[PDB]
Write a protein that binds this ligand. Structure first.
Ligand SMILES: *C(=O)[C@](NC(=O)c1ccccc1)(OC)[C@@H]1N=C(C(=O)O)C(=C)CS1
Length: 265
């Protein structure tokens, strides 16, 4: 029944949709193509910032990172404007989450160490949380310039939602670090037309979005009902038949979020 509605959405948008909301004490898990792989795009930036927080002392946030104009490979609304000053690990965190800054992310990986510019260390951090499915192989970008059917740089709605659940609602991070991550996602500036648009205004929403080629659009959120009940919502889509230059349908993610809201309501 729910599946049928999701399918209609799939038809209505010429897209592939993947949805997952973890089960709770009173609601069954919601799932559509929950175990199929979808490109991370920038959604990794969120558990990345938790990788960075887990590993180091709070104090580490103040550490200044220096980079050059050639380090700027991808959309960098913030890092582009600070080549002269550089940014603390804290300002990098903030921008990788709230503005989806491609360079801020590229830096924070590095700051994680080891082969793959940091991607092994990052996939290392996912594993540590029980996620054996997801994998980040490449750096920003290219991460969103893979072919449909390529398993590098992918995750599932299932896998990312359980991760996000531990970060924000669970015990993955000490409380101090927990509120840093959560507060940064609550003030995300890139998601107003996604999960957040599909839910009544009186539900609180935090999230981190992802966008890529082949009409890739993702959104991962934690929502709070008017009464304070939290749920984790993972919504992912691509439109492979439109090819590389296919356009991401944001209204797909907003609608699927409305279907989800009605079922949680
Ligand atoms: C996230 O994926 C992001 N953008 C891209 O990767 C990207 C988008 C479009 C074309 C090429 C690459 O950086 C990885 C940032 N996040 C968003 C977002 O909506 O959350 C973007 C829309 C683009 S920048």
């Amino acid at each position: 029944d729910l599946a049928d509605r999701f399918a209609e959405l799939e038809r209505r948008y010429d897209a592939r949709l993947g949805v997952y909301v973890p089960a709770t004490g009173t609601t069954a898990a919601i799932e559509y193509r929950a175990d199929e792989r979808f490109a991370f795009c920038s959604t990794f930036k969120a558990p990345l910032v938790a990788a960075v927080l887990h590993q180091n002392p709070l104090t580490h946030l103040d550490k200044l990172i220096t980079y050059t104009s050639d380090d700027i490979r991808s959309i960098s609304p913030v890092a582009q404007q600070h080549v002269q000053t550089g940014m603390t690990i804290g300002q990098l965190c903030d921008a990788a989450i709230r503005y989806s800054d491609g360079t801020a992310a590229n830096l924070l990986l590095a700051d994680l160490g080891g082969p793959g510019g940091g991607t092994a260390a990052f996939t290392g951090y996912l594993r540590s949380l029980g996620d054996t499915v997801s994998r980040l192989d490449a750096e920003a970008p290219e991460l969103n310039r893979d072919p449909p059917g390529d398993e590098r740089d992918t995750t599932t709605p299932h896998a990312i939602a359980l991760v996000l659940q531990q970060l924000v609602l669970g015990n993955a991070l000490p409380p101090d670090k927990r509120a840093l991550l959560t507060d940064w996602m609550a003030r995300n500036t890139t998601g107003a037309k996604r999960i957040r648009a599909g839910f009544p205004a009186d539900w609180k929403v935090i999230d981190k979005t992802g966008t890529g080629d082949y009409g890739r659009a993702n959104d991962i959120a934690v929502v709070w009902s008017p009464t304070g009940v939290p749920y984790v919502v993972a919504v992912m889509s691509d439109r492979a038949g439109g090819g590389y230059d296919a356009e991401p349908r944001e209204a797909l993610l907003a609608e699927a979020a409305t279907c989800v809201a009605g079922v949680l309501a």
